[PDB]
mmCIF file of C-alpha atoms in Angstrom:
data_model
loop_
_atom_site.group_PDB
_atom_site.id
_atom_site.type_symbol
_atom_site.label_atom_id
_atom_site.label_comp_id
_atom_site.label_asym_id
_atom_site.label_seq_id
_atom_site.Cartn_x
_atom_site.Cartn_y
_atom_site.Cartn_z
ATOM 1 C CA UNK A 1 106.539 86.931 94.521
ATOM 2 C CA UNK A 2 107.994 90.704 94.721
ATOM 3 C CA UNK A 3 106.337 92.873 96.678
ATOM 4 C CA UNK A 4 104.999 95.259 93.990
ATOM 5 C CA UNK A 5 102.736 91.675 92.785
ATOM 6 C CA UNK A 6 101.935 91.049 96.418
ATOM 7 C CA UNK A 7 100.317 94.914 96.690
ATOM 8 C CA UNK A 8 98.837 94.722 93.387
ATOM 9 C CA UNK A 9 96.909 91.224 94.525
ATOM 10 C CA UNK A 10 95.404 92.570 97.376
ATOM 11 C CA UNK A 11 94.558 95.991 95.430
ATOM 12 C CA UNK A 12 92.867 94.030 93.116
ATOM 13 C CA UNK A 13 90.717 91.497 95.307
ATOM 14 C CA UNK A 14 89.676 94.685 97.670
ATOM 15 C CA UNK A 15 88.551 96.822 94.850
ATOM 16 C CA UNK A 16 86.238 93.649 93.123
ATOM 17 C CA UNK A 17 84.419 93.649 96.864
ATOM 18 C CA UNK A 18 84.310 97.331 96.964
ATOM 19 C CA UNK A 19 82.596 97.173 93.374
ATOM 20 C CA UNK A 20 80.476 94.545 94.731
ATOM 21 C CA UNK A 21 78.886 96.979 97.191
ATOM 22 C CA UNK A 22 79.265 100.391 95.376
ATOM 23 C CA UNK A 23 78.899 99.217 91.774
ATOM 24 C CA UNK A 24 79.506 103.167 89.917
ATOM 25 C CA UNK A 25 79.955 106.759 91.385
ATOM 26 C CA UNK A 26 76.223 107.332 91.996
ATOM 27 C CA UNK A 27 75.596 104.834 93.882
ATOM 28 C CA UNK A 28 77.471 106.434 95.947
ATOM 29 C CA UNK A 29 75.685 109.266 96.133
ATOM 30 C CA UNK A 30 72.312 107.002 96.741
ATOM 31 C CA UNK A 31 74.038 106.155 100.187
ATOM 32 C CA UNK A 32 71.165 107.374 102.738
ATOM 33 C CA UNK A 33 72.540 105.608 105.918
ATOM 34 C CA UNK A 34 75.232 106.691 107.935
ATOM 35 C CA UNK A 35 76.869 103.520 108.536
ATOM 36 C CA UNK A 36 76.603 102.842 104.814
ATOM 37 C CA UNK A 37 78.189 106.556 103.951
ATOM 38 C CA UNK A 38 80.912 105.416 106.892
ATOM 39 C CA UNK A 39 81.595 102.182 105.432
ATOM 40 C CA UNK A 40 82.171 103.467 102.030
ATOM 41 C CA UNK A 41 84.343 106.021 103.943
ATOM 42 C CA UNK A 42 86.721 103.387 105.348
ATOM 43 C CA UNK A 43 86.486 101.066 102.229
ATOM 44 C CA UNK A 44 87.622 103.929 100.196
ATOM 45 C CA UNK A 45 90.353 104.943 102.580
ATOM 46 C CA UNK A 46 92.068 101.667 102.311
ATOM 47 C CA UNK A 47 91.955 101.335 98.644
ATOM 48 C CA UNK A 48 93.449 104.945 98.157
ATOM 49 C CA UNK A 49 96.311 104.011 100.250
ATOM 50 C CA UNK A 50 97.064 100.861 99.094
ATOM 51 C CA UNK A 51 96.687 102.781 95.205
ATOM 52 C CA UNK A 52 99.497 105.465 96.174
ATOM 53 C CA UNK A 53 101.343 102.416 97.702
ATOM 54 C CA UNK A 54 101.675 100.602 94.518
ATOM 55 C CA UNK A 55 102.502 103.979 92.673
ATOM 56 C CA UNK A 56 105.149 103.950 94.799
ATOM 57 C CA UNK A 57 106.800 101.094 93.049
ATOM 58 C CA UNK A 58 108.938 101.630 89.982
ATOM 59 C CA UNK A 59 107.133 99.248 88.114
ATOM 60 C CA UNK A 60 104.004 100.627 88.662
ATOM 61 C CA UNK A 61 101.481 100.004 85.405
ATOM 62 C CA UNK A 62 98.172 101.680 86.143
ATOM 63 C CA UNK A 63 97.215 98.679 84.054
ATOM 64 C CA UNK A 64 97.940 96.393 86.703
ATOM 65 C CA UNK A 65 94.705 97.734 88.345
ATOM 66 C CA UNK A 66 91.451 96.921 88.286
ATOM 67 C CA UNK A 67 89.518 100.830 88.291
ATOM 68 C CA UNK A 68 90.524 103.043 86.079
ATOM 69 C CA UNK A 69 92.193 106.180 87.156
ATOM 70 C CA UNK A 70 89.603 108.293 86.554
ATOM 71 C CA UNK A 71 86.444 106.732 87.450
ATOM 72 C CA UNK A 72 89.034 105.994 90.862
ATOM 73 C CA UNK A 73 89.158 109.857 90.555
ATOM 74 C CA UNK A 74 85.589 110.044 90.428
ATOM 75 C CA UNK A 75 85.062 108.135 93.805
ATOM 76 C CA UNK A 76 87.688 110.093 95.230
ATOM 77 C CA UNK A 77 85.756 113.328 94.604
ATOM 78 C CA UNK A 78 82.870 111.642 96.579
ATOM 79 C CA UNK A 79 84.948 110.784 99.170
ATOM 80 C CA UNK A 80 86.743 114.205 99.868
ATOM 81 C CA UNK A 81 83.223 115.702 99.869
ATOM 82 C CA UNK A 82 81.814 112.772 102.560
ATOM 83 C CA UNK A 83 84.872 112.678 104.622
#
């Protein structure tokens, strides 16, 4: 398959296992360890580059995604503030 699909697959698969373990935006905020706040950290790093990979693609369909835009948004603003 093209390599826009490829990127979009693996989007996709790591953002239903980041859901599994931060399931909305405040339960971000409910984080009280520091590995937990790290992990969330480096989970979230990896999706937001692999995001602005696939937006790199002329085909890009935010619709392709799971996340919306802006609840990603939303756990970005969490991130910026914890990173």
């Amino acid at each position: 398959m093209k390599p826009y699909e490829k990127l979009v697959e693996r989007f996709n698969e790591m953002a239903a296992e980041f859901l599994s373990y931060f399931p909305t935006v405040k339960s971000v905020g409910n984080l009280e360890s520091e590995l937990d706040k790290r992990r969330f950290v480096i989970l979230f790093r990896a999706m937001l580059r692999l995001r602005n990979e696939v937006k790199g693609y002329n085909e890009f369909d935010a619709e392709d995604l799971t996340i919306e835009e802006q609840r990603f948004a939303d756990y970005q603003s969490k991130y910026l503030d914890m990173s």
